[PDB]
Design a protein around this motif. Structure first.
Motif, PDB file in Angstrom:
ATOM      1  N   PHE A 133       0.875  -1.063   0.012  1.00 16.28           N
ATOM      2  CA  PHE A 133       0.011  -0.231  -0.148  1.00 16.28           C
ATOM      3  C   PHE A 133       0.918   1.265  -0.200  1.00 16.28           C
ATOM      4  O   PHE A 133       0.735   2.205  -0.747  1.00 16.28           O
ATOM      5  N   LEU A 134       2.023   1.365   0.874  1.00 10.11           N
ATOM      6  CA  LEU A 134       2.767   2.511   0.871  1.00 10.11           C
ATOM      7  C   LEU A 134       3.342   2.685  -0.599  1.00 10.11           C
ATOM      8  O   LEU A 134       3.524   3.951  -0.785  1.00 10.11           O
ATOM      9  N   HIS A 135       3.910   1.724  -1.034  1.00  7.89           N
ATOM     10  CA  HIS A 135       4.545   1.977  -2.413  1.00  7.89           C
ATOM     11  C   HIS A 135       3.609   2.423  -3.357  1.00  7.89           C
ATOM     12  O   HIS A 135       4.168   3.022  -4.230  1.00  7.89           O
ATOM     13  N   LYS A 136       2.454   2.012  -3.325  1.00  6.28           N
ATOM     14  CA  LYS A 136       1.481   2.570  -4.293  1.00  6.28           C
ATOM     15  C   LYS A 136       1.151   4.004  -3.918  1.00  6.28           C
ATOM     16  O   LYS A 136       1.063   4.846  -4.907  1.00  6.28           O
ATOM     17  N   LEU A 137       1.219   4.086  -2.759  1.00  3.83           N
ATOM     18  CA  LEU A 137       0.661   5.736  -2.060  1.00  3.83           C
ATOM     19  C   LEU A 137       1.681   6.480  -2.527  1.00  3.83           C
ATOM     20  O   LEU A 137       1.531   7.799  -3.016  1.00  3.83           O
ATOM     21  N   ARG A 138       3.087   6.018  -2.390  1.00  2.00           N
ATOM     22  CA  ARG A 138       4.177   6.759  -2.835  1.00  2.00           C
ATOM     23  C   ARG A 138       4.187   7.307  -4.129  1.00  2.00           C
ATOM     24  O   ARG A 138       4.825   8.230  -4.639  1.00  2.00           O
ATOM     25  N   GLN A 139       3.358   6.744  -5.168  1.00  2.00           N
ATOM     26  CA  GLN A 139       3.341   6.799  -6.510  1.00  2.00           C
ATOM     27  C   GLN A 139       2.396   8.001  -6.860  1.00  2.00           C
ATOM     28  O   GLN A 139       2.501   8.725  -8.112  1.00  2.00           O
ATOM     29  N   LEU A 140       1.455   8.651  -5.969  1.00  3.22           N
ATOM     30  CA  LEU A 140       0.586   9.659  -6.334  1.00  3.22           C
ATOM     31  C   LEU A 140       1.206  10.967  -6.564  1.00  3.22           C
ATOM     32  O   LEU A 140       2.111  11.348  -5.798  1.00  3.22           O
ATOM     33  N   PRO A 141       0.869  11.808  -7.661  1.00  3.70           N
ATOM     34  CA  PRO A 141       1.716  13.036  -7.937  1.00  3.70           C
ATOM     35  C   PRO A 141       1.376  13.988  -7.061  1.00  3.70           C
ATOM     36  O   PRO A 141       2.007  15.070  -7.177  1.00  3.70           O
ATOM     37  N   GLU A 142       0.096  13.756  -6.321  1.00  2.00           N
ATOM     38  CA  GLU A 142      -0.142  15.129  -5.299  1.00  2.00           C
ATOM     39  C   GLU A 142      -0.736  14.744  -4.010  1.00  2.00           C
ATOM     40  O   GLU A 142      -1.244  13.565  -3.958  1.00  2.00           O
ATOM     41  N   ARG A 143      -0.223  15.328  -2.956  1.00  6.75           N
ATOM     42  CA  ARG A 143      -0.595  15.026  -1.680  1.00  6.75           C
ATOM     43  C   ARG A 143      -1.866  14.980  -1.580  1.00  6.75           C
ATOM     44  O   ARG A 143      -2.472  14.210  -0.880  1.00  6.75           O
ATOM     45  N   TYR A 144      -2.752  15.877  -1.881  1.00  9.63           N
ATOM     46  CA  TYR A 144      -4.285  15.831  -1.934  1.00  9.63           C
ATOM     47  C   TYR A 144      -4.834  14.632  -2.178  1.00  9.63           C
ATOM     48  O   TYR A 144      -5.734  14.146  -1.802  1.00  9.63           O
ATOM     49  N   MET A 145      -4.169  13.894  -3.391  1.00 14.64           N
ATOM     50  CA  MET A 145      -4.580  12.400  -3.579  1.00 14.64           C
ATOM     51  C   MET A 145      -4.293  11.753  -2.680  1.00 14.64           C
ATOM     52  O   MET A 145      -5.206  10.614  -2.497  1.00 14.64           O
ATOM     53  N   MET A 146      -3.109  11.351  -2.057  1.00 17.40           N
ATOM     54  CA  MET A 146      -2.906  10.482  -1.074  1.00 17.40           C
ATOM     55  C   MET A 146      -3.783  10.693   0.044  1.00 17.40           C
ATOM     56  O   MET A 146      -4.149   9.571   0.881  1.00 17.40           O
ATOM     57  N   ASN A 147      -4.214  11.855   0.531  1.00 20.39           N
ATOM     58  CA  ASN A 147      -4.965  12.225   1.570  1.00 20.39           C
ATOM     59  C   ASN A 147      -6.359  11.686   1.292  1.00 20.39           C
ATOM     60  O   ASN A 147      -7.167  11.246   2.159  1.00 20.39           O
ATOM     61  N   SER A 148      -6.904  12.019  -0.127  1.00 23.49           N
ATOM     62  CA  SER A 148      -8.353  11.157  -0.507  1.00 23.49           C
ATOM     63  C   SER A 148      -8.407   9.746  -0.059  1.00 23.49           C
ATOM     64  O   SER A 148      -9.348   9.301   0.376  1.00 23.49           O
ATOM     65  N   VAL A 149      -7.098   9.161  -0.557  1.00 23.01           N
ATOM     66  CA  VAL A 149      -7.118   7.634  -0.334  1.00 23.01           C
ATOM     67  C   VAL A 149      -6.957   7.372   0.862  1.00 23.01           C
ATOM     68  O   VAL A 149      -7.817   6.349   1.417  1.00 23.01           O
ATOM     69  N   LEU A 150      -6.153   7.885   1.835  1.00 21.35           N
ATOM     70  CA  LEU A 150      -5.811   7.875   3.257  1.00 21.35           C
ATOM     71  C   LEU A 150      -7.535   7.957   4.066  1.00 21.35           C
ATOM     72  O   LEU A 150      -7.434   7.153   5.230  1.00 21.35           O
ATOM     73  N   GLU A 151      -8.098   8.791   3.767  1.00 18.47           N
ATOM     74  CA  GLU A 151      -9.471   8.779   4.291  1.00 18.47           C
ATOM     75  C   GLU A 151      -9.970   7.497   4.682  1.00 18.47           C
ATOM     76  O   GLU A 151     -10.748   7.258   5.488  1.00 18.47           O
ATOM     77  N   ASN A 152      -9.691   6.643   3.808  1.00 19.22           N
ATOM     78  CA  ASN A 152     -10.491   5.169   3.928  1.00 19.22           C
ATOM     79  C   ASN A 152      -9.697   4.265   4.754  1.00 19.22           C
ATOM     80  O   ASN A 152      -9.842   2.961   4.790  1.00 19.22           O
ATOM     81  N   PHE A 153      -8.245   4.503   5.308  1.00 17.05           N
ATOM     82  CA  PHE A 153      -7.729   3.311   5.789  1.00 17.05           C
ATOM     83  C   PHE A 153      -7.388   3.987   7.253  1.00 17.05           C
ATOM     84  O   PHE A 153      -6.959   4.899   7.714  1.00 17.05           O
ATOM     85  N   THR A 154      -7.745   3.070   8.233  1.00 14.74           N
ATOM     86  CA  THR A 154      -7.580   3.260   9.741  1.00 14.74           C
ATOM     87  C   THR A 154      -6.875   1.874  10.188  1.00 14.74           C
ATOM     88  O   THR A 154      -6.844   0.874   9.818  1.00 14.74           O
TER      89      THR A 154
END
Length: 193
Positions: A133-154
């Motif tokens: 998951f971290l290696h994919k998340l690391r691919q996102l071009p924008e921080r706002y996009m990583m935060n959209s995705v992370l809203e779903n992970f706890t």
């Protein structure tokens, strides 16, 4: 701090080594209504709502992390302490879109040290779900996009007295990514209702 009369969190880091890079680090209070977060965890019901019902409420905490994703072996280290000699069971449940995708259960016996008991769960290998998951998340071009995705992970950690099965600590973790200039940060909240 994150803790009760019986048990306190002393240290919690998640990191990657080749000096290490820490994604998040706590080294040791406002409140939040637990209903604000029911939807981020399974109705297992062993999940959050059920636990909180059965209490006690003062054992329940929310940590909000701003992670440093700006960097091998991937590990998690935790350290607790108390004045009582116990054996601890530590359950860590990763959730994605309100469903549990990982459950990791470890046990740790007290170690006497400088007048109190410490419980050291050091360098547990991070689950591969999370490493991938971290290696994919690391691919996102924008921080706002990583935060959209992370809203779903706890993550929901539950620490019980292994011999009595009494709940000692229950901690909900939620996550955003910090900007490339602001370091990691966390804030700890009491969960109430």
């Amino acid at each position: 701090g994150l803790g009760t009369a019986r048990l306190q969190l002393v240290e919690f880091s998640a990191f990657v080594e080749p000096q290490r890079h820490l994604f998040v680090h706590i080294s040791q209070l406002e409140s939040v209504d637990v209903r604000q977060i029911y939807d981020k965890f399974p109705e297992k019901k062993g999940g959050l709502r059920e636990l909180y019902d059965r209490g006690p409420p003062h054992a329940f905490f929310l940590v909000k992390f701003w992670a440093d994703l700006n960097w091998g072996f991937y590990g998690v280290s935790s350290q607790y302490e108390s004045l009582e000699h116990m054996t601890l069971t530590c359950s860590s449940k990763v959730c994605s879109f309100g469903k549990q995708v990982v459950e990791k259960v470890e046990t740790e016996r007290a170690q006497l040290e400088d007048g109190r008991f410490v419980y050291r769960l050091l360098r547990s290998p991070m689950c591969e779900y999370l490493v991938n998951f971290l290696h994919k998340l690391r691919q996102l071009p924008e921080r706002y996009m990583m935060n959209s995705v992370l809203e779903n992970f706890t993550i929901l950690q539950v620490v019980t007295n292994r011999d009595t099965q009494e709940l000692l600590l229950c901690t909900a973790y939620v996550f955003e990514v910090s900007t490339s200039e602001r370091g990691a940060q966390h804030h700890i909240y009491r969960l109430v209702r």
